[PDB]
Amino acid sequence: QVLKARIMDAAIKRMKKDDHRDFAGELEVLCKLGHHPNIINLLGACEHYLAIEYAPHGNLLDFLRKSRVLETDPAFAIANSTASTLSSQQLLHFAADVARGMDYLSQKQFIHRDLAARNILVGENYVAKIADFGLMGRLPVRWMAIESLNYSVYTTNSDVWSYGVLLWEIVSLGGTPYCGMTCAELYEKLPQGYRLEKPLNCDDEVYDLMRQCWREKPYERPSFAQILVSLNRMLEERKTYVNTTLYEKFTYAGI
Numbered sequence: 001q002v003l004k005a006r007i008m009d010a011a012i013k014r015m016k017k018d019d020h021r022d023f024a025g026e027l028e029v030l031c032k033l034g035h036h037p038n039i040i041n042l043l044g045a046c047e048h049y050l051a052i053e054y055a056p057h058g059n060l061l062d063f064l065r066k067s068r069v070l071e072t073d074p075a076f077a078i079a080n081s082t083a084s085t086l087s088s089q090q091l092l093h094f095a096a097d098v099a100r101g102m103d104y105l106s107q108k109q110f111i112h113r114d115l116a117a118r119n120i121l122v123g124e125n126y127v128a129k130i131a132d133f134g135l136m137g138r139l140p141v142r143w144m145a146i147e148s149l150n151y152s153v154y155t156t157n158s159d160v161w162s163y164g165v166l167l168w169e170i171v172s173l174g175g176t177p178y179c180g181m182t183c184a185e186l187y188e189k190l191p192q193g194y195r196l197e198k199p200l201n202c203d204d205e206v207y208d209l210m211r212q213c214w215r216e217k218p219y220e221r222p223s224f225a226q227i228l229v230s231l232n233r234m235l236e237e238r239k240t241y242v243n244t245t246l247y248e249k250f251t252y253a254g255i
């Protein structure tokens with residue numbers, strides 16, 4: 001029901017019940033969100049469909065995967081000895097973008113509940129933008145905090161847990177988290193302290209920021225501002241944090 005248009009350049013969701021409360025909901029929601037360069041921009045609703053500025057680069061998940069140059073075009077990759085058309089600084093920027101937008105939202109008592117690369121858009125100038133396309137409609141178990149899984153507790157602290165997973169997806173260049181692990185295998189091991197592993201191409205400092213996000217105690221996780229700031233510090237240094245160069249035994253995090 002989504003269609004491109006010049007309503008400026010944008011995207012509209014055509015809606016003709018339950019869908020009426022969601023539609024009356026989503027708009028009410030987007031109105032309250034305000035405007036920030038790291039969250040979607042709604043141009044308006046009309047009666048004749050909800051429209052927001054269009055994102056020419058799609059969702060971040062797909063973007064990260066097309067970035068897998070060794071798969072998309074090996075001649076170029078090998079020749080240039082690189083694993084992705086995206087650099088560490090660009091990856092960290094997408095991460096800083098989401099943390100920035102999320103900080104603008106959390107400050108407004110807005111709980112996202114479904115942060116994930118799939119729900120992020122890559123728009124004009126490659127500015128990551130927080131969005132929400134919707135959830136059979138099973139729950140996003142791989143991205144949920146332990147407390148969301150067991151008691152349906154949703155907060156900025158649980159949005160941070162999902163964020164940490166998203167950061168992992170970023171570094172992984174879009175790999176599925178808990179690759180080859182059962183959704184139920186998680187309800188078990190997660191409470192036992194199990195966590196995603198440090199991606200091979202990842203500097204310990206990024207991994208540390210990821211661990212902070214998934215701490216069992218909801219109140220011990222960093223705020224979205226402490227994340228923006230720490231990421232900003234990494235973007236600021238000369239040091240490279242996400243290895244993207246190619247090497248003999250190189251391999252991509254699974255999908």
Ligand SMILES: Cc1ccc(NC(=O)c2cccc(C(F)(F)F)c2)cc1Nc1ncccc1-c1ccncn1
Nearest residue numbers: 002011012013029039040050053054055130131132133
């Ligand atoms: C067409 C359309 C209408 C409305 C929203 N809304 C959200 O996200 C949203 C809802 C509630 C809360 C938030 C949050 F706070 F997170 F910001 C965001 C997204 C899309 N866009 C859309 N929907 C489905 C498939 C593709 C696209 C799409 C493609 C390209 N560019 C822009 N949009």
